[PDB]
């Protein structure tokens, strides 16, 4: 099963109970964005991140009464149609708001049962993606495909280190390709145990395909209330990219000397084949539109891995 | 019966009838569609060899001036990028794309690929979260039918085409329309089946390697390359990888007879075989700009993946 989260007086996490940390319900988010939850029917704002006032420019109480209808007039019917009751928690809808306080915000919404989860992040506003797609497809074998993928991602993102991290049948991992800035250790060829990416994280990574830690020294921002009014239970944040990263996992990034980290799941035959895995030495908020490019690349790599593995077997 | 290609018309080959269907060398027509321009150049020196006859009007230069310069001089910023992206021996399927600001012609999209020692350069005029939203909707579709319907509707919304169909191949290479989105008033093609020579054998092989092709105006005359043969080889210039390549006169007649002014399709490729086609029709001529066509190319790949996934959920 899982332990209760901390804020419901559950046990603190060690290296003895790695498999039972409820990484999906931390009750908090990373501070480079803001999150609201809301009722599926009424559009009634039920929870907000204590930092919402910053991003939205709204007097705190104003929000926690109001309706999405009021708050987001153009958007609220689109949401209603895009995310019908009963849809999967994996389905997401995005829009760009030109919002008074903040030039442009990206809005990302998904639905978990009766709750809409809304994420707001700063945003903005060429051929590198098309060029990359063809490059991946003409790679002659899996090894070269891995090399092209890591190089392409590094060029698109500027990340200090990009790796392709492949799982063995027992969930033992192996860096099979790596693109990195001069003057970093090389992780190429190394293997790491199956507990470094525990079971409940690999399950979540099979369904929700992209996660990041923008700053491995930043404090999480609580949800208020912490419990969902609807249920008097924890809000599932598994499909939110703003969800706070497991403190166990930021301590391993800090010990590695990483200040920022991103990963894309590569999913083949319904299973987690591997990860595109990025490091930055310093804090780094990759903007939403560039993340989208990596999300596309994730799908394309998933296709090409199968194609390429089929021409060996 | 499978038989080798006839020589093209310009090398004294025969004209095409319903008899010798499968023998038209559709990849070497010696000509392009008039909404863009094409140059060929030597892959090592960058000497310009062939150009479409309309090139002066896209590029704003006399032929003899174009042909008298190397790509190093014509494309000083792109020439080194081309050479890195398209190394000798690379496959003909690999494409490099850039946007140019050309004085006379505005923003041009440049698409380049390499066939042996030849570079092929295509120039076309070029111009929010719809793709991301579509990607997730496709993935959440519960079964093959719902996927097919979401895919057709999405493509129609992105493009404005009068008709978008998912055309699936059976094992005998007959195809059938399994989903479609269509303009009000058009008759349905849903559930209709069509004989295997409707899209013949030398075209299904090409459609497995080069995944997008179009006919922007089913009545437009093709524009010859000049000279017609590659001076490197005194042989035909391979154009199967060029979206501008002229369309077969046999296929253009079939579309005209159906009342179609513009046609486009993306290949859906599963396990190395051509599974199907995202086929679009428009009743009037219609040019879809290169950046919009890129969205369809990306959806072609997504759909190939999702078709595998939906079919595996099915035994
Ligand atoms: C007691 C549990 C431990 C643990 C937990 C844990 N790990 C993740 C996610 C990841 N762990 C990774 C480990 C590595 N990073 C590397 O660079 C290498 C090798 C070169 C390894 C082996 C990786 C890559 C991930 C994926 C996420 C990412 O890319 O940032 C989680 C889930 C975190 C979350 O969802 O927020 C958890 C709970 N890791 C351990 O090492 C042990 C001590
Ligand atoms: C003897 C010659 C014949 C012939 C040749 C031919 N056909 C193609 C390509 C296509 N034919 C298609 C036929 C259909 N159009 C539809 O709308 C439907 C069903 C609703 C069918 C069955 C299609 C869809 C294509 C693909 C191109 C496209 O999407 O428009 C070619 C190749 C063209 C080229 O590569 O330039 C050729 C040579 N087709 C015949 O029916 C006979 C007359």
UniProtKB/Swiss-Prot annotation, chain A:
Residue ranges of domain PAS in the record: 20-88
Residues holding a tetrapyrrole: 18
Positions of transmembrane segments: none
All copies of domain GAF, residue ranges: 141-305
Signal peptide per UniProt: none
The name this protein goes by in its record: Bacteriophytochrome
Family indicated by similarity: In the N-terminal section; belongs to the phytochrome family.
Consequence recorded when altering residue 249 to A: 100-fold reduction of chromophore-binding activity
Summary of the function given for this chain in its UniProt record: Photoreceptor which exists in two forms that are reversibly interconvertible by light: the R form that absorbs maximally in the red region of the spectrum and the FR form that absorbs maximally in the far-red region. Also has a slight blue shift for the far-red maximum. Could also absorb green light. May participate in regulating pigment synthesis like the carotenoid deinoxanthin which could protect the bacterium from intense visible light.
PTM notes: Contains one covalently linked tetrapyrrole chromophore. Lacks the cysteine conserved in plant phytochromes (at the position of Met-248) that binds chromophore. An engineered sequence used for X-ray crystallography forms a thioether link to biliverdin through Cys-18. The natural sequence can bind phycocyanobilin and phytochromobilin in vitro, but the identity of the natural chromophore is unknown.
């Amino acid at each position: 099963p899982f332990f209760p989260p901390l804020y419901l007086g559950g046990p603190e996490i060690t290296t003895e109970n790695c498999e039972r940390e409820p990484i999906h319900i931390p009750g908090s988010i990373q501070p480079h964005g803001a999150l609201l939850t809301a009722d599926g029917h009424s559009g009634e704002v039920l929870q907000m991140s204590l930092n919402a006032a910053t991003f939205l420019g709204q007097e705190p109480t104003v929000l926690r009464g109001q309706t999405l209808a009021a708050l987001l007039p153009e958007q609220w019917p689109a949401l209603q149609a895009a995310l019908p009751p009963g849809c999967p928690d994996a389905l997401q809808y995005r829009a760009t708001l030109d919002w008074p306080a903040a030039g442009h915000l990206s809005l990302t919404v998904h639905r978990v049962g009766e709750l809409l989860i809304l994420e707001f992040e700063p945003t903005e506003a060429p051929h590198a993606l098309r060029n990359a797609m063809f490059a991946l497809e003409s790679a002659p074998n899996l090894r070269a495909l891995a090399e092209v993928a890591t190089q392409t991602v590094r060029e698109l993102t500027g990340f200090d280190r990009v790796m392709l991290y492949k799982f063995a049948p027992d969930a033992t991992g192996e860096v099979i390709a790596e693109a990195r800035r001069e003057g970093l250790h090389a992780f190429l060829g190394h293997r790491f145990p199956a507990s470094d990416i525990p079971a409940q994280a690999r399950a979540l990574y099979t369904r929700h395909l992209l996660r990041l830690t923008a700053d491995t020294r930043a404090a999480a921002v609580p949800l208020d209330p912490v419990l969902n009014p609807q249920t008097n239970a924890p809000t599932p944040l598994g499909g939110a990219v703003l969800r706070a990263t497991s403190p166990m996992h930021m301590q391993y990034l800090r010990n590695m000397g990483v200040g920022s980290s991103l990963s894309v799941s590569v999913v083949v035959g319904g299973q987690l084949w591997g990860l595109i895995a990025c490091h930055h030495q310093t804090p780094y908020v990759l903007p939403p539109d560039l993340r989208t490019t990596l999300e596309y690349l994730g799908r394309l790599l998933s296709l090409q891995v199968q194609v390429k593995e089929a021409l060996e077997h």
